Ligand binder design. Structure first.
Ligand SMILES: [K+]
Ligand SMILES: [K+]
Lengths: 281, 290
């Protein structure tokens, strides 16, 4: 009983709460209410009844965690983003597999011209990393009837058919490759010329991690060198002053696979409230 | 336990066969053998032990069906087509939902500009016609977390959450509508000004059936009025004399959803053997019309 949303929320946000938190009493900013659960963006406000703090963002390292009594549980909203990013990765991947751009252009020029498309069913999707995004993607991949090879030291679930032991090993078994891996000193530029060299024919790389996991000058030369390999990416080096983006064999998006600087996805609000409800069963 | 492949097959085909049918004795043409199962292209050979005949093609109209004895089950192989079509439908669907074309155009000119996208998760996908394509589409939709509403001439499966009463009722409960219904006298011109008026705000329509199930002037007229509505189609009227094709709120493709012409997807042959294996566990696929 009792939830306090610590940020300005329109009627659509309020609507979702009515739906998801039926049986709870809602309180909205600015009418502070000391509740058992408070949903936040960046800042929180402690009280006597605080039990759980639900962030709506993907991570929580931007909030003041030290200020949180160990009697209170802080939760992220990572699941919402795993979901949105996966949809996005598949949108890029399918756009290329079905040559959606090239055919659309033709068809609108009044040209009817048939060409084969790549089918996902029966193919191998290699995945660098296996966090929430990788898991969601794997879940989609299996539904599409793909085989999943993953390179990670994390635990995997039943949607992973093969744990690869090296990136190169992963590359050799993949028709598609998704980069969904943390950026550390070991992964920075891990995607270089030597790794790319292992690329199956018609390999399609999909990047929804960080641009630095990939070597820029290496990917550009590699993409020039292997005209059959495509690089589809939601991330680019030095956003927003992106340069060297006019490539033929690439499809790009401006880092919108998930959370946006300007707003809150309905799904984020949705899953945050659901997580609150689940926390109390 | 006995399968006879009544046609020339290579090592590729053979490997697939040994993997899928590992635990069945295989025989290869032309070393005929009276097996329980026969895989064919155009001709079958009757035996004394024949129980099942598996065509590797989608249709059997070129097969002497009338000549098949009553106890022998004839199966066909059409799964690849609906699989392919469902994949093409989600490709159009997501292209629009993630503003793929527009963002890509901007990014390539060095213009970094964020904008929100549409998510499939949690949304209602209305399917018009629940056949092989609609079933496959619904399997993918459930995976994406979508809710599924179907309008059909009976028979839906477990991946359908709501059966509608009419096409207008379907449009009323849908954020996305997929058209995968056969073109007949009652479906011709089916999608009209009157039906479209039911479209929720921002409705996205995907057509993987036939252009004629849709009234051309009504759709083109509705897209001007109702500019939030998009029409994504893999089929256009007339074809190839396409006209009138340069619409803003539309993404189109040249009837390539199910492949091309007499394209044989490498995956068809595997599905054929798999159905043989499933048939003998007692679970062949149900032969749904597309
Ligand atoms: K997106
Ligand atoms: K296609």
């Amino acid at each position: 009983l009792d939830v306090y949303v610590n940020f300005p929320a329109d009627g659509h946000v309020r609507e979702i709460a009515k739906t998801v938190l039926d049986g709870f009493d809602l309180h909205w900013y600015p009418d502070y209410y000391d509740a058992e659960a408070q949903v936040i963006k960046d800042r929180y406000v402690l009280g006597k009844r605080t039990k759980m703090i639900q962030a709506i963002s993907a991570g929580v390292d931007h909030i003041d965690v030290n200020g949180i009594p160990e009697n209170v549980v802080l939760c992220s909203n990572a699941g919402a983003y795993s979901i949105s990013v996966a949809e996005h990765a598949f949108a890029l991947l399918l756009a290329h597999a079905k040559n959606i751009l090239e055919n659309n252009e033709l068809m609108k020029a009044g040209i009817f011209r048939q060409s084969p498309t790549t089918l996902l069913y029966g193919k191998a999707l290699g995945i660098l990393g296996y966090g929430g995004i990788g898991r969601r993607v794997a879940h989609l991949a299996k539904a599409f009837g793909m085989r999943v090879i993953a390179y990670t030291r994390s635990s995997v679930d039943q949607n992973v058919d093969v744990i690869s032991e090296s990136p190169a090993d992963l590359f050799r078994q993949s028709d598609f490759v998704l980069i969904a891996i943390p950026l550390t000193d070991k992964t920075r530029g891990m995607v270089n010329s030597r790794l790319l060299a292992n690329a199956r024919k018609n390999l399609t790389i999909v990047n929804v991690a960080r641009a630095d996991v990939v070597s820029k000058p290496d990917m550009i030369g590699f993409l020039k060198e292997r005209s059959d390999v495509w690089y589809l990416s939601d991330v680019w080096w030095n956003e927003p002053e992106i340069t060297e983006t006019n490539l033929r064999n690439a499809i790009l998006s401006p880092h919108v696979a998930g959370g946006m600087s300007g707003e809150i996805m309905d799904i984020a609000i949705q899953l945050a409230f659901e997580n609150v409800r689940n926390f109390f069963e």
